[PDB]
Amino acid sequence: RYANKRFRKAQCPIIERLTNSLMMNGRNNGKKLKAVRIIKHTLDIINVLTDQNPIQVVVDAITNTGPREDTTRVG
Amino acid sequence: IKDMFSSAMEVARFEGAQIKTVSGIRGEIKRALSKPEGHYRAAFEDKILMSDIVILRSW
């Protein structure tokens, strides 16, 4: 259970937290074993291309794309 | 219940009617079933058989 507390969502191991955001469409909700089979097929590809680690890349992906200043609407 | 009323409009002139059976149970006929032209749903007081013959009294 990661939904109950406010910041309990942080301790999800991000590889799962990446698979959970893969099943976001009405054609895709409630199909996790399809999503896990994608990531295990995806993490193989990142190795074959860039030898380093898939999981070092996924961590380095989230560090880059998350913005640093976001703009909001004022009244 | 089949083949008592010919059209789905004929049932609608007769809904709410106190249908009874041979066996002596009562009921009412409620809605005209659509996809065949004649039949209708009817709620009795207990489980009707297949071997049983409904009769609606009239004058």
Binding site: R1, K32, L33, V36, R37, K40 | -
Partner: protein, 125 residues
């Protein structure tokens, strides 16, 4: 007689009746080895009570597990629960106590759902 210990494992509506007795080191699920579990991606979800504590501690024991109910996934959460409970309730009975608190601290730091049923009873707000 024969030293055995019976523990249960429960997810959504799936039970898991794991008899654990002293033996040679075979681990069966429904009259079939544990290397033949169905979903084939979640097979390492049931190798967790094997590989967390170390595969040596299964060398003398048998793990007969039979499951009913549930789905494909919610049975795999039942066999990983009843193997963890069936291992950690044999060391408090027929092997040493200090083994048990080494195991119960091993499964705890990894995932507490192995031991106690995470019951997702409702909440009204």
């Amino acid at each position: 007689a024969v030293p055995s210990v019976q523990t249960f494992g429960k997810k959504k509506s799936a039970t898991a009746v794991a008899h654990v007795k002293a033996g040679k080191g075979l681990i069966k699920v429904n009259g079939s080895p544990i290397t033949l579990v169905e979903p084939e991606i979640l097979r390492f979800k049931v190798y967790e009570p094997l590989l967390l504590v170390g595969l040596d501690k299964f060398s003398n024991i048998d793990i007969r597990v039979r499951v009913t109910g549930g789905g494909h996934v919610s049975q795999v959460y039942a066999i990983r629960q009843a193997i963890a409970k069936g291992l950690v309730a044999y060391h408090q009975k027929y092997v040493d106590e200090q083994s048990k608190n080494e195991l119960k601290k091993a499964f705890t730091s990894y995932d507490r759902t192995l031991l106690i049923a995470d019951s997702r009873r409702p909440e009204p707000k």
